[PDB]
Write a protein that binds this ligand. Structure first.
Ligand code: FAD
Length: 451
């Protein structure tokens, strides 16, 4: 049996562990955190994640989808809260079968942990990777107290998150060609209690958006009718716009409350613990880190956030991470050797990672800056018309990334053709009546091969 060592029992690591273990691999998985299935007296604070077709399919191949969806809240559409109009529900896709699932991060991790152990993988918690000696095929682990433990390894899988230790150790033997691109937006995670959401009639079966240009909020529901709310806001105010809102201006909960009362008046009543959550939770940072290569020979390979950290604006980090796990397991299982597997895995997935990394950055301007634009509404109306006339040619880019498994590079390449197509057809036209629908349909068939 081929042996594999996996660092990080996160989402990608536990999935790939399951897939290799049921294929007969001797799988050992190391995790720095304690086992979350051991119940303690601590009050865990977990957030919800948007599970889409890519992630759902990855769980389907692993035999875990039914179990995960049983604990997920169905989101049938996007609930846009734009001032001046009532909350507007925008259904997903074309039919009632296209939905996104809101799954609690902790619930999902437990299901994957159980899933990996049932396939035969061994999971070792409370052990963080410190360094790798690639020459001697050894690594060093330690607990929080710093007691060191050495282990032999044949194949090392880095599934240890944005701040991957496998990635850092790989940087000693190969130039990964890393380019960190930091994001000026930070995020703050707030809570809406079940009582609060019910009191203000917040739809449980929808994903909510409060667009506001350079800042915004999103909310995803949990099984108990609570919601986890993410505020996206500039870390600092630029000198060009010194009075623009930023986290630096929100020094306490009293400032945060006045900010929300003025800029999110319908959302602020639902934030019972806005003052407490604002000062007791850290302001998270966002970044896009790109790598030229993801592997060292047949010795080590990165996947998930370890290989391609991205901004969460498209809700696709986990989905891409689960998709990575399937591809990595497929290549490892069927290749002539580990080095051929790892080189082929990188070649297949690296272009798609750069694509979803790019599309995630663009999608912030789409959901927070465009959903209230007059030109964008006409382009969106015309794009929906093309999705019905050519259902296999004009698939809106959000549907391709979210509701299909088309490679991220194809979705971005087809999306730029559609974006430019809508841009030129709507240009210099006020109403949809002055737009020639059949000329737009002709260019759809000319430039977009059917799927
Ligand atoms: C605010 C926010 C919202 C998001 N929302 C969504 C969403 O709606 N949909 C979506 O698809 N994605 C979303 N994402 C992205 C998603 O959470 C991540 O992309 C996903 O968790 C990546 O999975 P992974 O297994 O690669 O890493 P992780 O899931 O982070 O797992 C990494 C694991 O490695 C462990 N580890 C780290 N260092 C070490 C070490 N040195 N030794 C041992 N173990 C180690 C960690 O403890 C952890 O268990 C969001 C991200 C953020 C920040």
């Amino acid at each position: 049996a081929r042996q594999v060592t996996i660092i990080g029992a996160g989402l990608a690591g536990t999935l790939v562990a399951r897939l290799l273990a049921r294929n007969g691999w001797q799988v050992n998985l190391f995790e720095r955190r304690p086992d979350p299935r051991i119940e303690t007296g601590a009050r865990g604070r977990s957030i919800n994640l948007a599970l889409a077709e890519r992630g759902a399919h990855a769980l389907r191949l692993a035999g875990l989808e039914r179990e995960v969806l049983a604990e997920a809240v169905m989101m049938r559409g996007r609930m846009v809260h734009v001032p001046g109009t009532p909350p507007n529900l925008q259904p997903y896709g074309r039919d009632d079968s296209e939905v996104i699932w809101s799954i609690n991060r902790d619930r999902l991790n437990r299901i994957l942990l159980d899933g990996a152990e049932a396939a035969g993988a061994s999971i070792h918690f409370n052990l963080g990777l410190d360094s790798v000696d690639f020459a001697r095929q050894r690594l060093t682990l330690s607990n929080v107290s710093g007691e060191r433990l050495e282990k032999r390894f044949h194949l090392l899988i880095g599934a240890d998150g944005c701040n991957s230790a496998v990635r850092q150790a790989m940087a000693s033997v190969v130039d990964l060609g890393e380019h960190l691109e930091t994001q000026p937006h930070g995020y703050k995670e707030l809570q809406i209690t079940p009582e609060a959401s019910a009191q203000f009639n917040l739809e449980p079966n929808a994903l909510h958006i409060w667009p506001h240009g350079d800042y915004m909020c999103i909310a995803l529901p949990n099984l108990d009718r609570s919601f986890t709310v993410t505020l996206f806001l500039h870390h600092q105010s630029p000198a060009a716009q010194p009075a623009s809102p930023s986290f630096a201006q929100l020094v306490d909960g009293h400032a945060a409350r006045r900010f929300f009362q003025r800029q999110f008046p319908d959302l602020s009543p639902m934030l019972d613990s806005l003052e407490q959550d604002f000062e007791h939770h850290p302001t998270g940072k966002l970044a896009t880190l790109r790598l030229t290569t993801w592997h060292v020979g047949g010795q080590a390979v990165l996947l998930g956030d370890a290989a391609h950290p991205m901004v969460p604006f498209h809700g696709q980090g986990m989905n891409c991470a689960l998709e990575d796990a399937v591809a990595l397991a497929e290549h490892l299982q069927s290749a002539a050797d580990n080095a051929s597997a790892l080189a082929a895995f990188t070649a297949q997935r690296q272009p798609d990672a750069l694509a979803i990394q790019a599309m995630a950055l663009e999608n912030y301007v789409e959901m927070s800056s465009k959903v209230a634009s007059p030109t964008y509404l006409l382009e969106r109306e015309l794009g929906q018309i093309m999705a019905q006339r050519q259902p296999t040619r004009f698939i809106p880019r959000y549907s391709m990334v979210t509701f299909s498994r088309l490679p991220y590079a194809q979705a971005m390449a087809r999306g730029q053709i559609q974006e430019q197509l809508l841009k030129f057809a709507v240009a210099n036209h006020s109403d949809l009546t002055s737009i020639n629908l059949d000329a737009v349909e002709h260019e759809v068939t000319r430039c977009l091969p059917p799927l």
